[PDB]
Design an enzyme around this catalytic site. Structure first.
Site, PDB file in Angstrom:
ATOM      1  N   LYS A 205       0.813  -1.215   0.000  1.00  0.00           N
ATOM      2  CA  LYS A 205       0.000   0.000   0.000  1.00  0.00           C
ATOM      3  C   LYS A 205       0.847   1.266   0.000  1.00  0.00           C
ATOM      4  O   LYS A 205       0.382   2.323  -0.443  1.00  0.00           O
ATOM      5  CB  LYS A 205      -0.922   0.001   1.215  1.00  0.00           C
ATOM      6  CG  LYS A 205      -0.162   0.002   2.528  1.00  0.00           C
ATOM      7  CD  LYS A 205      -1.093   0.148   3.709  1.00  0.00           C
ATOM      8  CE  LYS A 205      -0.639  -0.675   4.906  1.00  0.00           C
ATOM      9  NZ  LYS A 205      -0.679  -2.137   4.638  1.00  0.00           N
TER      10      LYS A 205
ATOM     11  N   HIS B 226       1.746  -2.722  15.303  1.00  0.00           N
ATOM     12  CA  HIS B 226       2.307  -1.637  14.510  1.00  0.00           C
ATOM     13  C   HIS B 226       2.506  -0.439  15.427  1.00  0.00           C
ATOM     14  O   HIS B 226       1.537   0.093  15.976  1.00  0.00           O
ATOM     15  CB  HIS B 226       1.417  -1.282  13.313  1.00  0.00           C
ATOM     16  CG  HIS B 226       2.113  -0.458  12.276  1.00  0.00           C
ATOM     17  ND1 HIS B 226       2.585   0.812  12.526  1.00  0.00           N
ATOM     18  CD2 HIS B 226       2.453  -0.739  10.996  1.00  0.00           C
ATOM     19  CE1 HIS B 226       3.167   1.287  11.439  1.00  0.00           C
ATOM     20  NE2 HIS B 226       3.101   0.364  10.495  1.00  0.00           N
TER      21      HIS B 226
ATOM     22  N   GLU C  59       6.631  -5.568   8.580  1.00  0.00           N
ATOM     23  CA  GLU C  59       5.838  -5.029   7.472  1.00  0.00           C
ATOM     24  C   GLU C  59       6.313  -3.628   7.090  1.00  0.00           C
ATOM     25  O   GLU C  59       5.524  -2.679   7.081  1.00  0.00           O
ATOM     26  CB  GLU C  59       4.354  -4.997   7.836  1.00  0.00           C
ATOM     27  CG  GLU C  59       3.745  -6.320   8.255  1.00  0.00           C
ATOM     28  CD  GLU C  59       2.434  -6.130   8.993  1.00  0.00           C
ATOM     29  OE1 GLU C  59       2.154  -4.990   9.421  1.00  0.00           O
ATOM     30  OE2 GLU C  59       1.677  -7.110   9.132  1.00  0.00           O
TER      31      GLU C  59
END
Ligand SMILES: Cc1ncc(COP(=O)(O)O)c(CNOC[C@H]2CCNC2)c1O
Ligand SMILES: Cc1ncc(COP(=O)(O)O)c(CNOC[C@H]2CCNC2)c1O
Lengths: 406, 411
Positions: free
Chosen positions: B69, B197, B274
């Site tokens: 993304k 995250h 990530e």
């Protein structure tokens, strides 16, 4: 391809009923992507309303507000003009068969190659508000008909010291003299009051200022005839300052400062007025969380967001009101709830707090008046695709469009 | 330099002794005497390869799964796939993109905690087994649409110092995590790990320590209910350029001792991350042309410059990503040259389409170029064509040695 696919709207049915039907049809399908219903008949109604309220003013639709090809085709058949801001919008309008004299290139600060594109395709009328723009026009489009865009005061603007467009009266005089020096023809004046207009008297002031610049032009030797009163008119009835109040203030000012016998030609650049209420958006609740505060609160996640259709919350200062598809029973309990977009962004939030009955994954939420500055500025961030638009039109609406063509 | 055919897969050689900056200079000089001066990117795929080498060196225990993304350019994903990274996909379209490039499903994590049912079904149909979740309703949806999935429980983090906060929207508390694990056991759904995250644009590295500690706790919770937890996903938030206070290596120097303390290698844990902006931020440099100009008298001279990219295009990062952009001149200015207070504006009709409110620049002219470095992350991925303005062309470059390094990674 759905772009040019239009569905019949049967007698006694509204866009709302069509929305209900489509929702019921997919009740157990499990394919529940967000979608628009766009009633082209509402655009025809808006045109009739404009003809009634502003009979002296030719509308040039602001393509940037919503560049859907069906919209532009309907408006072109209706006989409106078009306000284009770039080469792509000009291409779109001309591909639909609109001749260049129904196009205004109303971008005051244009890339030279796009000015040349306009010149190559016979688009003669362009706006301007600076001397450098005059140099660019003299070098790339010397026979163009220029419309001087003057500044308007928005007391509610967030950035009042730095205005992006519009020449002051003082600057306007120098611009007219400079255009005379360069043998560039200035044929009129434009202004834009802005969507966030609270007092219609602003228009009066703008019109008065426009008259002043007209007088300046007459002093410098120009034959001024074009008055462009811009846009900013509301696109729905869900506003404090309604269209007819604005026009009731505008028409006496036009008669006072620009009487018809003078030979003036009056145009406007409405964008949201034509399209805002024509589009209704249906989003599906794709996820759900319950947070205990024991008072229950809910977080609902839907499959359209601030990177998609609801970018209008950020760019257009929009205030969106979620509506329930299935009518709630009168006694059922409401809970404090938030509505979130599908993306990873923690700020992708559509509604911070509202009161809703307990809803479930698979339920739909409706957002009316989503036609203006919504799909035109959507992105595919996170890979989420733009909602499909279903165009509808009744038989009588098609007949009315035919009458406009004739 | 001119693309022929497909922009996506056309790559130009970067000759010895040349950097991306020199390619920018060449492209600018090449069009010096013509009126087609559209904005364009130079994207150095070699910088992405350098970032991968740096990651392997700094986080040897952590397998990177690139966050598509952040920048979904096909050239980027192809380069990273050849390099052997994993991919973090947020939607059906991103999974489609990754699989079209030949990446097998076990190198994909569907790390979207709140997924539309039909997209979960798409993931199941194409063999993508690993997905994240943070709620009971998500467990219901998975039980109904992907019952054999391997779930990763995403936990909340204190990301108050992060530039882009995610925890308000996503992440289960420890208290909620216990209930989620028990509920997953009831529904016969396999939970294999934990993700978190710290927030994009991390400012305090200690957050990671607490997050890792919380992950250990949830691992233990899983062990109590009968799960064999092995996957630890430490998310993203790493910086993508050296133009930041908190540099990559400080963060990793804080992360690695915490990983050794809470998740020693002998336990059998598999650790992934990530990273999105880390891989791509500095690889893209944007060149915009000054298309319009106004002089405002205060006689103190001030200037308004209009360029052919804006907040609806690449500079949407100013609104969505809290970006602070620094305009750079093609030719470094002489020290004696006079500077003026200046504003920089986008091409659209929007009065708020403003890139830079006030900065000091020498007097510039229409046709001059401005450069913006570190424009790889969350810029083109969220751009629109509002007002009809087209997306800037991207020119991909790669040197011979960079290609050799990529070959070494592929083997
Ligand atoms: C020069 C010019 N003409 C017309 C319009 C259309 O205005 P409407 O209010 O009638 O749609 C505009 C619009 N310009 O900016 C409005 C943006 C700002 C935030 N989203 C809409 C115009 O500039
Ligand atoms: C679940 C998940 N994984 C990775 C990332 C990438 O973060 P980076 O900081 O490494 O790029 C994210 C990011 N999600 O949202 C950050 C956006 C919001 C505004 N611009 C950045 C993520 O959510």
């Amino acid at each position: 391809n759905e772009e040019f696919d239009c569905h019949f709207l049967d007698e006694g049915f509204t866009a709302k009923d069509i929305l209900d039907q489509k929702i019921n049809e997919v009740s157990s399908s499990d394919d529940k992507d967000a979608f628009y219903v766009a009633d082209l008949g509402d655009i025809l109604k808006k045109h009739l309303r404009w003809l009634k309220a502003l009979p002296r003013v030719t509308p040039f639709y602001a393509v940037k507000c919503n560049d859907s090809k069906a919209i532009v085709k309907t408006l072109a058949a209706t006989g409106t003009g078009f306000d284009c801001a770039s080469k792509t919008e000009i291409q779109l309008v001309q591909s639909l068969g609109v001749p260049p004299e129904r196009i205004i290139y109303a971008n005051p600060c244009k890339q030279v190659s796009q000015i040349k594109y306009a010149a190559n395709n016979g688009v003669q009328m362009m706006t301007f508000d600076s001397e450098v723009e005059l140099m660019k026009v003299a070098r790339a489009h010397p026979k163009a008909k220029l419309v001087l865009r003057i500044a308007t005061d928005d007391s509610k603007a967030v950035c009042r010291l730095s205005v992006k467009f519009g020449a002051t009266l003082r600057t306007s005089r120098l611009l007219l003299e400079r255009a005379k020096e360069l043998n560039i023809d200035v044929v009129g004046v434009s202004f834009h009051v802005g969507s966030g207009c609270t007092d219609p008297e602003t228009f009066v002031q703008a019109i008065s200022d426009a008259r002043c610049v007209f007088d300046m032009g007459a002093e410098v030797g120009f034959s001024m005839y074009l008055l462009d009163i811009g846009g900013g008119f509301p696109g729905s009835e869900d506003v404090k300052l309604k269209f007819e109040e604005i026009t009731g203030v505008i028409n006496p000012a036009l008669d006072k400062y620009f009487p018809s016998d003078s030979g003036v030609r009056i145009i406007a650049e409405p964008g949201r007025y034509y399209v805002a209420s024509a589009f209704t958006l249906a989003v599906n609740i794709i996820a759900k969380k319950i947070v205990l505060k024991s008072e229950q609160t809910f977080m609902y996640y839907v499959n359209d967001g601030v990177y998609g259709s609801f970018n209008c919350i950020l760019y257009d200062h929009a205030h969106v009101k979620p509506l329930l598809q299935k009518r709630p029973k009168p006694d059922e309990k409401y809970y404090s709830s938030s509505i979130w977009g599908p993306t990873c962004d923690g700020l992708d939030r559509i509604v911070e707090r509202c009161d809703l009955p307990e809803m479930h994954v698979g339920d739909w939420m409706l957002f009316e008046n989503m036609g203006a500055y919504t799909v035109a500025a959507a992105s595919t961030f996170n890979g989420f695709q733009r909602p499909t638009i279903y165009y509808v039109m009744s038989g009588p609406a098609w007949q009315l469009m035919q009458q406009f063509q004739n």
